[PDB]
A paper describes a structure:
Compound 21 corresponds to another interesting derivative designed to probe the impact of the peptide bond in PDF binding. In addition to the hydroxamate group, this compound features both a hydrophobic benzyl group at P1' and a reverse peptide bond. Compound 21 shows modest but significant inhibitory potency to [name] (KI*  = 400±37 nM), confirming the crucial role of the peptide bond in PDF binding. After soaking with crystals of apo-AtPDF, compound 21 could be detected in high-resolution electron density maps. Unlike 6b, 21 did not bind the active site of the enzyme but an alternative pocket at the surface of the protein. A docking study performed with EcPDF had previously revealed this alternative binding pocket. Upon binding of 21, the 3D structure of both molecules of the asymmetric unit remain in an O conformation (r.m.s.d. <0.2 Å with respect to the apo-structures in the “O” state). This finding suggests that only the binding of compounds entering the S1' pocket, such as actinonin or 6b, induces conformational change, in keeping with the crucial role of the P1' group if located in the frame of a classic peptide bond. Moreover, we noticed that the binding pocket of 21 was located on the rear side of the true S1' pocket and induced a weak modification of the P1' hosting platform.
Author numbering: 1 to 181
Write the structure that this text describes.
């Protein structure tokens, strides 16, 4: 497996609804949880492991044998709190890059579980922060999209280094450039 890095177009592509709730889905969910634990995460979205589907694995405790393993298939955020909070946010798709992002403090979510059954969940604090970050991934939205112009300016060169790395690895032009903003 791999974590897909910016500016790989997989991180922007449309993520497809999941219709099939079978053993293959269970196997993918297992693999994703295990990447999440390997990388000390609280949540992981399918596009970040190269699969453009509406799937997130999540454990609010973010540690083995703690919290709960929540599978969110086709999730939708139904409500965002009016209250906003800043947080020094990171992203595995942008290795070593951290910057301030302002987001709602809490959210309410509708999703389907591993069997396709509807459920809802409310999150606050760090779990809500991580969820929103990963939910953005499911909508092809990356964390610098959420930064102020001033904060973005502070990481532009780091993003350009990633753009160059992609061009060197693939022989293709970077499909997006932070310059465009
Ligand atoms: C920032 C605007 C476009 C006003 O609304 C959103 O993108 N809302 C976000 C929640 C949010 C994130 C960060 C700061 C403030 C609110 C929800 N959203 O993507 C709606 O399309
Ligand atoms: Zn691998
Ligand atoms: Zn496993
Ligand atoms: Zn596991
Ligand atoms: Zn940890
Ligand atoms: Zn992630
Ligand atoms: Zn991320
Ligand atoms: Zn939006
Ligand atoms: Zn430039």
């Amino acid at each position: 497996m791999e974590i897909v890095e910016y500016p790989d177009p997989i991180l922007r592509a449309k993520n497809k609804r999941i219709d099939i709730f079978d053993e293959n889905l269970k196997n993918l969910v297992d693999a994703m949880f295990d990447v999440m634990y390997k990388t000390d995460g609280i949540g992981l979205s399918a596009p970040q492991v190269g699969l453009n589907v509406q799937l997130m694995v999540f454990n609010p405790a973010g540690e083995p044998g703690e919290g709960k393993e929540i599978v969110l298939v086709n999730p939708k955020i139904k409500k965002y709190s009016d209250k906003l909070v800043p947080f020094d946010e990171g992203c595995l798709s942008f290795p070593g890059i951290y910057a301030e992002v302002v987001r709602p403090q809490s959210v309410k979510i509708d999703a389907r579980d591993i069997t396709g059954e509807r459920f809802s969940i409310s999150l606050s604090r760090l779990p809500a922060r991580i969820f929103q970050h990963e939910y953005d991934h499911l909508e092809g939205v990356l964390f610098f999209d959420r930064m102020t112009d001033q904060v973005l300016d502070s990481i532009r060169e780091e993003l350009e280094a990633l753009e160059k790395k992609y061009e060197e690895k693939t022989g293709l032009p970077s499909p997006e450039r932070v310059e465009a903003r």
